[PDB]
Amino acid sequence: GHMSSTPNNIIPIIKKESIVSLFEKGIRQDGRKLTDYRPLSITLDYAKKADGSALVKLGTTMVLAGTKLEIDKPYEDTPNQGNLIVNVELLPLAYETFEPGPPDENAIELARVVDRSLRDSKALDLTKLVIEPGKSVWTVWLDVYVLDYGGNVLDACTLASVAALYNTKVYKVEQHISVNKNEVVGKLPLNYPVVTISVAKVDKYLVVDPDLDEESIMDAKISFSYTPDLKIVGIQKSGKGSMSLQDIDQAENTARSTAVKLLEELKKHLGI
Amino acid sequence: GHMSSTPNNIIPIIKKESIVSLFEKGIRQDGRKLTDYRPLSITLDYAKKADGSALVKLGTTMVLAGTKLEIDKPYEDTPNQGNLIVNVELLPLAYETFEPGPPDENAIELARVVDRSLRDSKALDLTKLVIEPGKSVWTVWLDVYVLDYGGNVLDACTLASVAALYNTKVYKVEQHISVNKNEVVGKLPLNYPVVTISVAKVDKYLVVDPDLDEESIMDAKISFSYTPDLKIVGIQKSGKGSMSLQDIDQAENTARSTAVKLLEELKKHLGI
Amino acid sequence: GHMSSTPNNIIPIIKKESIVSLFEKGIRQDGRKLTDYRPLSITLDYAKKADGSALVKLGTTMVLAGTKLEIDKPYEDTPNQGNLIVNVELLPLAYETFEPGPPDENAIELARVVDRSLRDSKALDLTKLVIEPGKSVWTVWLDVYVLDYGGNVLDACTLASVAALYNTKVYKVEQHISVNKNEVVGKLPLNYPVVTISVAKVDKYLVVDPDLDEESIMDAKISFSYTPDLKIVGIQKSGKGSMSLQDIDQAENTARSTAVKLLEELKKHLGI
Amino acid sequence: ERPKLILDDGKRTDGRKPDELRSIKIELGVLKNADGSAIFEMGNTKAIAAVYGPKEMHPRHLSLPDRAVLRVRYHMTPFSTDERKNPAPSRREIELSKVIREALESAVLVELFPRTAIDVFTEILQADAGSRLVSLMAASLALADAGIPMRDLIAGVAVGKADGVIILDLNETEAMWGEADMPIAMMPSLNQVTLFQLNGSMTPDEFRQAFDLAVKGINIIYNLEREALKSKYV
Amino acid sequence: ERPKLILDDGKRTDGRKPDELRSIKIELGVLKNADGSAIFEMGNTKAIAAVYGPKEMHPRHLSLPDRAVLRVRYHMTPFSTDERKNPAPSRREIELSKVIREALESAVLVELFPRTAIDVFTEILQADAGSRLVSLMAASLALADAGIPMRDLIAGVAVGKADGVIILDLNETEAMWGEADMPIAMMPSLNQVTLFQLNGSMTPDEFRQAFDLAVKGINIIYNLEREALKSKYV
Amino acid sequence: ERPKLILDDGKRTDGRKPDELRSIKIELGVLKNADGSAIFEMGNTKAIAAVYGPKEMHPRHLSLPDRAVLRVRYHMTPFSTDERKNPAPSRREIELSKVIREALESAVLVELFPRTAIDVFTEILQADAGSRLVSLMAASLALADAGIPMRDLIAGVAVGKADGVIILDLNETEAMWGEADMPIAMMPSLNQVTLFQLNGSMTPDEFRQAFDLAVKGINIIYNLEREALKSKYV
Amino acid sequence: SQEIVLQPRSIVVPGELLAEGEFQIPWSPYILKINSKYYSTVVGLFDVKDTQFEVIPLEGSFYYPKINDIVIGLVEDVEIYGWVVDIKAPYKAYLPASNLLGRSINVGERRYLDVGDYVIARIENFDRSIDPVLSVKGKDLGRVSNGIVIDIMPVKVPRVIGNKSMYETLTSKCSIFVANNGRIWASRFSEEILIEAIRKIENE
Amino acid sequence: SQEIVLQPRSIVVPGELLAEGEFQIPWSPYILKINSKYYSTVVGLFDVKDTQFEVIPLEGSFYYPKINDIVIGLVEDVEIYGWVVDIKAPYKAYLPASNLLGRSINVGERRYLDVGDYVIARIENFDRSIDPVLSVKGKDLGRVSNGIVIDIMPVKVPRVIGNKSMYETLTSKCSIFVANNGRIWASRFSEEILIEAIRKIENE
Ligand code: NA
Ligand code: NA
Ligand code: NA
């Protein structure tokens, strides 16, 4: 048994004013526009024993995603599909108040939001992960480790996840069925990338890619996932506060505009 | 690892006297006789996605039992029997001090006492739950949820359990083996009902079906299970206090007399 | 998730001096030499439903080890070996501050050190525990219960473990595969005994088989495992304090000299 | 996907038009011990909620010095689903407990009771889609029944898309086989959204069409909520 | 059921008459750290118990202001049973820990030590039926060995029915295959029952016959308990 | 055993001589929130460490009145190993967390901060043997990066035996198939050993030969540690 | 530009608009002001007294402490320097040993109040920062020996009193005191005033 | 038989030998004496002032409390009798209500300091046995209304001050106060003194 409790980065009264002092001019503390992401770095193949991996740095947020593939029986009700299992860990390395333990509700939410966006996007078509229909399929274990919690971890987890998937080597399968790790025969087949765009409501402003301070003062945030044709493939409101109908409408319009740019950047990093 | 600790509904000194003030006349606060159950309501098929269910209201105690059947392999040492698994949950809904978590020792005891009374009564003959001897049998998952803790939850759990079992639909099994939930072919086969009768010792009095206040002031309680031929098919003393040999003798005599009436009421509710 | 924390038998300033007051003469409180074990008693077949067992008393330390064998499939990567599973429990019976729970880090360490010494010694050759190559093998469950924590529990766990293994009955296996417990066909085949010798550093002295008081004041301890040819088959430094290179060199020389005597005593107890 | 979800007459698999809600039944004050309680049924989806508090939260280092802590559980009974659900909390239940709690946090006037906990326990008795919203509304109603001040009631509904058609208040068939499922809950008198999620996929124009339809359903549900609370007095 | 439990000579599978107890061996003061300790053997059933306290219970919000809290563990070793028992507490062990604790609560003079805990730990070393009673009696004796005031010792025995015959002090064969198993424990000098359970089935006349036989066995066991406690002084 | 570990040219499976270390790379200050942080790579074994504190440890009955408590985690990521490692702590991780903590306890000047906790978290990103030492050294360096006083840095290396040859700084092949693996860590300027373990088997003369070789490797590693800490200033 | 939206004595529910415009109403937990609009926060009865309005809560089992209120508490713990008392609030109350004794605790001294006793006390200190402190200084304050104590919803207390009209009707049945925290100090036949109490709570 | 091993202003690391011989140095957390040898315990700068030496720490985000130090705290809780204050130390600080008010707490009395306020205070009590007690008695001590508060590594505070040379260079840019606990009280353009601060912490 278990339950969700109200949790607080106690922020000084003075500091809040300073954080929003330039929003009127369309810019934040760090000089960036309300619609700008922080500087993004994606390092592929960072975790050398992962089947694929990506280290994502998004401002001071750092996430390492890694995959490992295994041969399994398909679940009996989906004999013609492989499997995707997403786990996110908010490491105690990442932030002072994060003590160790199994995934808490925040890590579980992040995993599930990411999983839905990957699965519902149809970026990873699990029917492609069949080896022998009804007998052997690939299971894709995606493990996503937040190493440095610098704000907007969800967007970074999405980027890391997609990059790690695109980086995933597929090894030769030998019949007698064994995996031969001396022979890479392919890469995991993705249809396209996906991005998740989080918009935080801060008083009368909407801000893309909130940092730690901005997340400390926001009313709420809403995250929108997109594929390149700009279909919406996931939404999640989070936080204690509410938003108006109009706030959400505006947030989506703003998230979509940013998604176009973020997708193009991500593709450059992936080599597609 | 785990251990059992002394736990307390801190009851005022004044209130106790009032609770027993009418026992001399053979009646309690609520006007009922020392040997009377509280008003009982049994609503069958309450949980519409359960294979069978019953909502039992016994005074202010409320218990919802539900069953689900699944096809499984018999345990290797009982190839010619199906299975019965009983779980009881004391929901945090039920009482103020019940916090959420897995079953505590009280919920586990209740489950095990109920299970023994069902199994030892031979009311549910598990040899009848075989589909293909040594290959496929029914597992009966019985889940018993205490929604409102108003005293004598054990007796209510027994009634709910028996009623849910009698209410349990059995679906067509198709050979190729699959369950076809579009076709009800039977009801779970019971030999008879069972009841559990709890007698609380309150000073020099024995009281049937104690309420919350009476349970707060009792020395101990003893519960006796009966089938219609009035065989005793389970006994459990519970509580911190002891009882005399003579108290137990009297309690059984009193429990048995009440069981006759409770069985007849239960049968009316079940339509048998 | 989980982590290791600094834990303290708060010992009086006065008591420490007394504990070491005779080390200069080569003796401790109890009259024993720095290189002497405490009085050892090994009672075989103590736990009558165990396949083998041994109750070891080493001073006031008391450990009961028991085995149970089961037929299992070999792990797929070792088709031509049986299995050994070692579990140690520091029972709350054993010491005042030991509360109940699953194995804590101390019990897990003890299990793993013991397991390595048994396995790495090659005392128990698991290839001998095959019934049908690639289909059925023995699993040896070794469960080691510290009943009285009187110091140097590791050495006592090793002795108990080895004695229980040597005491382990093997039953007739019947083909149809079932174990017939009415017929003992053998004893578990061991190549030789193993011992673990723990040396505690106490100021400028090294002490074999520290008692509870000596463990309360030691800087650190180092344990060395030996077979009869006096190969070293395991080492483990434990404790908060460090030791010099020279301390360890000396400790090993001293541990080995004691091992010769402890092995001979152990063999007398085992009847080999 | 497999079963047809919009039939040739333009109606759904259970007889409803695209803009028609399932039938709603609300009962209040159903539990004797709980400070407040409610049963909420929306078609074959049914939840019970029990509220306790505010009461002093013992730790007490997990309390907040300026407001109450909400403690909230979303749990499904094992017999609430087509096939038995294991009673151990799933990742889904963990997520949904947080989402429901955060929805309640915008509504409950927690600053009235510093250092306390308000416990909100919901159980899904029958699951046929929309159970996170039915639990949330049963909770909102149980909090009202308990006399715990709130800025507004919360009403919610899932909209979605089935065989290309935007639809209101999905059943399990539509949730399982449709293209999109978007639960929305609001404080309707305050124009504020408390819960908002989408799974599946929608174009941005479909999203806006669905959001608009949800608001219509929410306003119907809210009036039923208000009328249910008043009925024992009226 | 399968094996014959009452043979043609009227004796049981281990040679005993229906009204004959298994052999009993009691040892006290077996552990050096424990404040009190005991080993109790009844035929092939054997338990060890260790007692600590009374000592201040740290929380301290789980203490009682007028009496000590008893903390009690019934646990079976993995090698105590015919086939390995997994060392994780089972539902059975959970139930039996409570039943044993509640039996000890009537005996231990807990009101002497407000705000403390008295810890009682039992381990079943060999299980051949009646282990809940052997653990309980080993505990009662360990508490005596620890000098913790009690109103009386507790003695207990299981009676039952095998092939229709009422029998005293069941072994595992009888427990497994007989018709009824009824563990009873008392404070014999006080005429008070501390533990009482039945599994299986008995007519009410059989129940009374069995209860009467149990009392006879209990009085034999009690005198052995008293004599064991006195022996180191006598 | 199966693969040859010492080839005909006298070199090891990765090209190294018996007394040659793998390549080492150290990075400090890699995490923004951590009070100190480090990445340590020794060949294909790579760990990251983060340090927080000293800070008041809340309980507070788990604090020590004369010194800080170290809280230490050794954990391997699921993708750090040839086959996926389940993320739940294994018995191995539990043991290694204690061994690493106890190694740090000799070094950290804990008596400076009574009643506090110093949290040390390590993650193995790539495991190719020696990961307990690489985690330990990354920790030692992260503590330095955090400004937490220590008597010395800790440097460590595993020595062992492969095909009869005493070897320095094992890779996973040697760890898996060799005869002995002996991790040693020291405070080198103080001549003190902080961690010392052996698995496998060695004669006592082999043990001394290996121990001597380890000290040589440790002194090389230590100078790299010192130079890495100084580099951002030098 | 001012108006009340609802008739007086309207049944009201959370979020229900009561008034638009600028009123000068004392803050109340039952009414939320958002700019120039006022909303009920509870299930209640909207009541307009003069130019001012209020919401009378119909639900709630908790008492909110008010300084100088008279309560009936139930003693739940005896501590070193006083007693923890349940006064049916979200916060436990405390009665200092020194208040009851008129002096400091003596060396080696549950004789006056132990767990389970009812005690009639005035709330001496309370604010948003602290749990209520109790006093037993006044007359007829202290431990309750005889009689009974009937519980009601605290929101009902003004209705059980009624220019003390209802106080008088009950006592025409029998002697009762109606505490601020929804507890009522009160032959065995006439003890069935609780039949009446339960009627005030379900027919108001 | 005395010698310093290293040149002055040497970069030093834990375990690094600084000196051999008998010196009479005040104990310092940054230097460990083992018989006649002295070692750095930190990453730092070895400095020799006269016949005495010290290590200047270059790392560390914590402030070690010192009696009579002036700190900028952040209020984290309001308790019955005072406030818990974060002063960026391993220990939380406490400000008694009685110190701020000049009198004892009145009946029924966050008006002066609530969660989130900065407060400038002197450390009044501290030792190895207790958390720091704060005072706001001095002038210009108390709640900070206007301005900002910039955080630095506390080990940097002497460098931000510099015969107060650096204090003067900054204020030539703008008014700043440099607290002992690595916090600095200080138009929106000139608010970019924090560009300079971050330079003192990464170029010292
Ligand atoms: Na949750
Ligand atoms: Na239990
Ligand atoms: Na550990």
Residue numbers in the entry:
A (entry chain A), B (entry chain A), C (entry chain A): -1 to 5, 7, 9 to 176, 180 to 275
D (entry chain B), E (entry chain B), F (entry chain B): 8 to 241
G (entry chain I), H (entry chain I): 6 to 114, 117 to 169, 171 to 181, 184 to 196, 200 to 217
Could you give the paper's own sentences about this structure?
This architecture results in a barrel-like complex with a continuous central channel implicated in RNA binding in both archaea and eukarya. Whereas the archaeal exosome has an active phosphorolytic RNase PH core, eukaryotic exosomes rely on the additional hydrolytic RNAses Rrp44 and Rrp6 for activity.
To trap a complex of the archaeal exosome with Pi and RNA substrates bound at the active site, nonameric 3∗(Rrp41/Rrp42/Rrp4) complex from S. solfataricus with the D182A point mutation in the Rrp41 protein (Rrp41D182A) was used. This point mutation was previously shown to completely abolish RNase activity but is not directly involved in RNA or phosphate binding and presumably allows for both substrates to bind without being turned over. Rrp4/Rrp41D182A/Rrp42 mutant exosome crystallized in the cubic space group P213 with one copy of each subunit in the asymmetric unit and the full 9-subunit complex is generated by a crystallographic 3-fold axis. The small error of only 0.1 Å in coordinal positions for this structure (as estimated by the refinement program REFMAC) allows for accurate determination of the hydrogen bonding distances. This analysis reveals that the Pi ion is bound by four residues from the Rrp41 subunit. Specifically, the phosphate is coordinated by the side chains of R99, R139, and S138 as well as the main chain amino groups of G137, S138, and R139 (numbering according to the S. solfataricus sequence). A total of eight contacts with binding distances of 2.6–3.2 Å are observed creating a strong phosphate anion binding site. The two phosphate binding sites are almost identical and reveal very similar interactions between the protein and the phosphate. The position of the Pi-binding site is highly conserved between archaeal exosomes and RNase PH and PNPase enzymes indicating a conserved mechanism of phosphate-dependent RNA degradation among phosphorolytic exosome-like complexes.
